[PDB]
Design a protein around this ligand. Structure first.
Ligand SMILES: C/C=C\C=C\[C@@H]1O[C@](O)([C@H](CC)C(=O)NC/C=C/C=C(\C)[C@@H](OC)[C@@H](C)[C@@H]2O[C@H](/C=C/C=C/C=C(\C)C(=O)c3c(O)cc[nH]c3=O)[C@H](O)[C@@H]2O)[C@H](O)[C@H](O)C1(C)C
Ligand SMILES: Nc1nc2c(ncn2[C@@H]2O[C@H](COP(=O)(O)OP(=O)(O)NP(=O)(O)O)[C@@H](O)[C@H]2O)c(=O)[nH]1
Ligand SMILES: OC[C@H]1O[C@@](CO)(O[C@H]2O[C@H](CO)[C@@H](O)[C@H](O)[C@H]2O)[C@@H](O)[C@@H]1O
Ligand SMILES: [Mg+2]
Length: 393
RNA sequence: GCGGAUUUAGCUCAGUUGGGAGAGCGCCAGACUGAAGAUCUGGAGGUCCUGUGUUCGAUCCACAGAAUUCGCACCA
C-alpha cells in the first residue's frame, strides 16, 4: 500500500464482546462512523463489518473482524467478536490479545448466558479492563429499568472479580447513532471517551527480541503471503530475518513489508496488530498458532513438565477427577492443541481444585520457552491454568 | 474462518440407534505329497480413530479432539 500511517498517540487495541443479538457488531460500525466526523477519521458499515456472506444470510457474525478508528489522545484497533456460543473459541483468541474490552449489553433483556460466558472468559484470558455499554436504550424508557439492569450487570462483573462499581457504563443506542440522531451520536463519544479516560496507557515491551504469534493469514494478489497479529514484543524492521516457528517444520524467511491497516509501515512495535509479508512463503505453508520471530530465539517443542492448577467446579471446571491419559486442549498464545497427560509416580488422580505437576505431550510441536504460561480447556469449559516448568521435548 | 462425509482384525468389508463383536483373505500349527501350490482341519488375531461427561454399564448418545477427504468463505 502507498499511504503511510504516521505515528501519533499511544496505540491501544480494543474490542466488543457480549451476548448475542444485542449490540456488538453494530456498535462497532457506529463508533467508526460517528467518530469519522466528531474527530474526522474514516468509517465503515455493517455490510462491511459482517462482510462474510454466511454472516449476511444467517445474520450473526462468525469470525472476528478488525476495524480502526481514531480518538484524539489514542489510536484504536477494534476487534468485533461473535457472541454465538458455537464460536467462543473464535472470540477467545480475539479477546486474548485485547488491552481493554467494551462489554455490550442490551437494556431490554439484560444479563444472558453468552454475557456471563464472555466476562468469565475475559477475566480468564488476559484483558484488564471492561467498559459496559447498555444498548438499545431506544427501546426502553423507564429510567428505573436501567437502574435495575445496571445494578445487576455490576453485581455480575464483580462476581468474576472486576471493578464493576468503579466500572464506567455508557447508556446509548447503536443503530440510532449509526443512523444519525445526534442525541445518541453523543453517547457514542461518552464511550469513545472512556477508552482513553479509562485505558490507561499500555506498557510496550520493545526492550526484548522480536516475536509475533500469528493469528490470521492472507494472500494479497499484488504482493505475497501475509500474516497478522499483535506483536508480543520487540520490533520487526522490514527487511529483517524471521523464523516461522512451531506446528510445522521451522521455516526461515525475511520480512518484506509491515502494514498497519492497509497503511504502509517500516516497523511494527509491540502492541500493534500488524501484517507481515514473509517472502517465498505460500498460503499453504504457514498457519495460525505459529510464531514469527528473531531467528534462534525460540525453538519448537512437544513434551514438557508443567505445574498446573486445575480449577474447581466453583470456578467453572471439572467436578470429576482425571487420570493418566486425560487429553484436553492446551492453549498457547494464539491457539490450542491436544496433548496427553501423564501423572507422577505417586499420584493416581487429580481433583478439581488440586494443583499438580504433570508431563504433557502435545500432538503438535509448539514455540515454547520454559516458564511460558498456558491454559487448558476441555469439552467446553476451562479445565485449568498452568505454566511450562521444564521442557523435555 | 464456516460446513458435509468416512473411520469396526494385517488387507476387503458386514453388524449394533448403550448390555459387554463377525466373514473372506492373509497370518501360527497339525493332514496329504520328495515338495511347491491347491485344498482339508484346526487355533491366534480388534483399545470398534482418541479423550471426557451421562450412565448400574458407552463401539453407537453428549461434550471436546485426530486423520483422510469434499465443498464454501475471507484477503495487510
Ligand atoms: C481462557 C482461554 C485461553 C487462555 C489462554 C492463555 O491463558 C493464560 O495462560 C492464563 C494465565 C493465568 C490461563 O491459564 N487461563 C486459564 C484460567 C485461568 C483462571 C483464573 C486466573 C481464575 O483463577 C483461578 C480466575 C478467573 C478466578 O476464577 C473465578 C471464577 C469463578 C467462576 C465460577 C463460575 C461458575 C460456577 C459457572 O457456573 C459459570 C459462570 O458463572 C459463567 C460461565 N460459565 C460457567 O460455567 C473468579 O473470576 C476469579 O477471578 C495466559 O493468559 C496466556 O497468555 C493465554 C491468554 C494465551
Ligand atoms: N432497537 C435497537 N436495535 C438495535 C440496537 N443495536 C442493534 N440493534 C439491532 O439488533 C440486531 C443486533 O445485531 P448485531 O449488532 O450484529 O448483534 P451482535 O450484538 O453483534 N450479536 P452477534 O455478533 O453474535 O451476531 C440488529 O438487527 C441490529 O440492527 C439498538 O441499540 N436498538
Ligand atoms: O487517513 C487517515 C489515517 O491517518 C492516520 C495516520 O495515517 O491518522 C491521522 O488522521 C486521523 C483521523 O482524523 C487523526 O485522528 C490522527 O491524529 C492523524 O494522525 C491514521 O490513524 C488514520 O487511519
Ligand atoms: Mg454481530
Amino acid at each position: 500500500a502507498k499511504e503511510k500511517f504516521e505515528r501519533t498517540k499511544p496505540h491501544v487495541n480494543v474490542g466488543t464482546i457480549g451476548h448475542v443479538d444485542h449490540g456488538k457488531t453494530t456498535l462497532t460500525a457506529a463508533i467508526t462512523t460517528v467518530l469519522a466526523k466528531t474527530y474526522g477519521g474514516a468509517a465503515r458499515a455493517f455490510d462491511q463489518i459482517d462482510n462474510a456472506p454466511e454472516e449476511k444470510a444467517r445474520g450473526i457474525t462468525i469470525n472476528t473482524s478488525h476495524v480502526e478508528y481514531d480518538t484524539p489522545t489514542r489510536h484504536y484497533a477494534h476487534v468485533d467478536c461473535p457472541g454465538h456460543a458455537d464460536y467462543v473459541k473464535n472470540m477467545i483468541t480475539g479477546a486474548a490479545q485485547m488491552d481493554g474490552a467494551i462489554l455490550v449489553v442490551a437494556a431490554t433483556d439484560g444479563p444472558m448466558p453468552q454475557t456471563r460466558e464472555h466476562i468469565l472468559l475475559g477475566r480468564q484470558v488476559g484483558v484488564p479492563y471492561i467498559i459496559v455499554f447498555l444498548n438499545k436504550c431506544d427501546m426502553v424508557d423507564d429510567e428505573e429499568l436501567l437502574e435495575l439492569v445496571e445494578m445487576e450487570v455490576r453485581e455480575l462483573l464483580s462476581q468474576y472479580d472486576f471493578p464493576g462499581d468503579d466500572t464506567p457504563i455508557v447508556r446509548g443506542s447503536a443503530l440510532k447513532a449509526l443512523e444519525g440522531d445526534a442525541e445518541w451520536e453523543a453517547k457514542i463519544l461518552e464511550l469513545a471517551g472512556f477508552l482513553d479516560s479509562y485505558i490507561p496507557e499500555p506498557e510496550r515491551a520493545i526492550d526484548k527480541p522480536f516475536l509475533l504469534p500469528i493469528e490470521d493469514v492472507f494472500s494479497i494478489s499484488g504482493r505475497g503471503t501475509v500474516v497478522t497479529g499483535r506483536v508480543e514484543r520487540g520490533i520487526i524492521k522490514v527487511g529483517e530475518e524471521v523464523e516461522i516457528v512451531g506446528i510445522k517444520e521451522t521455516q526461515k524467511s525475511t520480512c518484506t513489508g509491515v502494514e498497519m491497516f492497509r497503511k504502509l509501515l517500516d516497523e511494527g512495535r509491540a502492541g500493534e496488530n500488524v501484517g507481515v509479508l514473509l517472502r517465498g512463503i505460500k498460503r499453504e505453508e504457514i498457519e495460525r498458532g505459529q510464531v514469527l520471530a528473531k531467528p534462534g530465539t525460540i525453538k519448537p517443542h512437544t513434551k514438557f513438565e508443567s505445574e498446573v492448577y486445575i480449577l474447581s467446579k466453583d470456578e467453572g471446571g471439572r467436578h470429576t477427577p482425571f487420570f493418566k491419559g486425560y487429553r484436553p486442549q492446551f492453549y498457547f498464545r494464539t491457539t490450542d492443541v491436544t496433548g496427553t497427560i501423564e501423572l507422577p509416580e505417586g499420584v493416581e488422580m487429580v481433583m478439581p481444585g488440586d494443583n499438580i505437576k504433570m508431563v504433557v505431550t502435545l500432538i503438535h510441536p509448539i514455540a515454547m520457552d520454559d516458564g511460558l504460561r498456558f491454559a487448558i480447556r476441555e469439552g467446553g469449559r476451562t479445565v485449568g491454568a498452568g505454566v511450562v516448568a521444564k521442557v523435555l521435548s
